[PDB]
Ligand SMILES: *[C@@H]1O[C@H](CO)[C@@H](O[C@@H]2O[C@H](CO)[C@@H](O[C@@H]3O[C@H](CO[C@H]4O[C@H](CO[C@H]5O[C@H](CO)[C@@H](O)[C@H](O)[C@@H]5O)[C@@H](O)[C@H](O[C@H]5O[C@H](CO)[C@@H](O)[C@H](O)[C@@H]5O)[C@@H]4O)[C@@H](O)[C@H](O[C@H]4O[C@H](CO)[C@@H](O)[C@H](O)[C@@H]4O)[C@@H]3O)[C@H](O)[C@H]2NC(C)=O)[C@H](O)[C@H]1NC(C)=O
Ligand SMILES: *[C@@H]1O[C@H](CO)[C@@H](O[C@@H]2O[C@H](CO)[C@@H](O[C@@H]3O[C@H](CO[C@H]4O[C@H](CO)[C@@H](O)[C@H](O)[C@@H]4O)[C@@H](O)[C@H](O[C@H]4O[C@H](CO)[C@@H](O)[C@H](O)[C@@H]4O)[C@@H]3O)[C@H](O)[C@H]2NC(C)=O)[C@H](O)[C@H]1NC(C)=O
């Protein structure tokens with residue numbers, strides 16, 4: 001048995017600001033079995049009941065929740081969600097854990113596929129995050145107070161005590177440098193190289209209240225509330241427009257950087273990878289991930305094959321727009 005996965009939701013009918021921390025979506029504490037992970041956006045949505053409070057959801061539920069709760073732009077939602085689902089979800093049950101492994105995603109897929117959730121390191125989740133530490137140090141998912149203290153420090157140093165685009169530029173680079181110096185397994189290429197820039201502007205574009213139209217900047221109180229406690233600020237109103245990675249280009253421009261990693265299990269040994277995706281070679285990310293999916297699913301048949309074909313297509317519909325045109329790949333043929 002299994003599920004027939006629907007195509008992704010489109011943009012919301014209403015795209016203006018609104019109160020999202022409302023009576024129908026109260027913060028609630030974790031219960032036993034509830035899953036949380038490396039994403040403060042999804043974490044907050046689950047802890048306010050925009051997602052199932054147990055942190056396991058369908059792609060469709062994730063897309064709608066990111067739109068409803070934060071006005072995450074539809075294409076960005078599709079690109080992120082099916083990326084996470086293809087690599088880390090259960091394609092038969094159509095369920096993805098926003099954190100680690102759980103029976104709630106249903107019967108496990110055939111290895112080497114895992115449905116292990118967004119916590120799985122090395123193809124999606126990766127190094128030099130803002131409030132999470134690299135997997136090498138033992139925990140890639142929990143809030144890390146030391147890293148948050150650095151976030152605060154950089155906000156004091158470059159943003160007048162607030163997180164803004166200038167802070168994002170400085171913090172992104174400094175976090176790269178931390179990982180070069182301390183993590184001999186540090187990788188910063190392919191998916192991670194791309195996602196690591198967008199992630200640093202989401203707090204500006206999506207965590208700042210939507211009633212703020214000029215000089216958008218995030219207070220440390222609001223940052224702590226979301227990044228640490230998975231709680232919307234009091235009276236939080238979402239972005240007044242669909243938004244995602246606006247300004248990520250400026251973050252890169254502040255400290256130009258090339259995909260790569262520390263070679264040969266050694267610190268301070270960063271080598272460029274000329275084959276990696278980058279921001280002028282985005283379709284390589286698409287091809288790379290399709291390749292990764294084939295490694296996870298070398299010979300699917302039946303429902304699994306069907307659901308793979310559909311999810312791959314759904315992802316491509318977003319990638320095609322977001323990346324400015326990529327030739328669709330059909331590793332398992334057609335339906
Ligand atoms: C994230 O948050 C941060 C923090 O809030 C935020 O930072 C602000 O960013 C803006 C711009 O990005 C800053 O405003 C600019 O400041 C520039 C630097 O100014 C210095 O130099 C000025 C020029 O000096 C001349 O004259 C002196 C003699 O006095 C001489 O030695 C020099 O050689 C030179 O010839 C000087 O005017 C200025 O001093 C003034 O302001 C300070 C207060 O900061 C005051 O104490 C002084 O008495 C004096 O009034 C300072 O020393 C400046 O160049 C720049 O100017 C341009 O823009 C203005 C306005 O648009 C025009 O009027 C002007 O003609 C220029 O074209 C501008 O004012 C601001 O200071 C930052 N604030 C802080 C606290 O750091 C980031 O922007 C945020 N990021 C995002 C993306 O939002
Ligand atoms: C929350 O997140 C932080 C940050 O990721 C974690 O703290 C880091 O923990 C790691 C592992 O203990 C530390 O790594 C070691 O750092 C040494 C360098 O430290 C100095 O230099 C850096 C800047 O270059 C400063 O930030 C720091 O304060 C020090 O002044 C390295 O020399 C070590 O290398 C040795 O081990 C590696 C791995 O085996 C080898 O490859 C090397 O060859 C060598 O033998 C090592 O990498 C790191 O410094 C910590 N950072 C900070 C600033 O604390 C927290 O543990 C994590 N946990 C919490 C708080 O919940």
Ligand code: HEM
Nearest residue numbers: 038039041066070072080084125126129130131132199206
């Ligand atoms: C749409 C589906 C989403 C998926 C699948 C997703 C997935 C992820 C993953 C896997 C990470 C960890 C990245 C890493 O370690 O390399 C992450 C980080 C992050 N996500 Fe999400 N995310 C989604 C939506 C959102 C939304 C809507 C927001 C903001 C409103 C958001 C904000 C963030 C931020 C700020 C981080 C960085 C956390 C840190 O470094 O401290 N995400 N996300």
Ligand SMILES: COc1cccc(OC)c1O
Nearest residue numbers: 075076079194195245322
């Ligand atoms: C990781 O996803 C993306 C990377 C770069 C650009 C995007 O949309 C404009 C985008 O959605």
Ligand SMILES: COc1cccc(OC)c1O
Nearest residue numbers: 076080194195196198199
């Ligand atoms: C659309 O782009 C993204 C969505 C969710 C998380 C991301 O980086 C961690 C990211 O870059």
Ligand SMILES: COc1cccc(OC)c1O
Nearest residue numbers: 309310313330333334335
């Ligand atoms: C709606 O169109 C499709 C649905 C599922 C799979 C497809 O091609 C792989 C496809 O083209």
Ligand SMILES: [Mg+2]
Nearest residue numbers: 125126127129
């Ligand atoms: Mg990470």
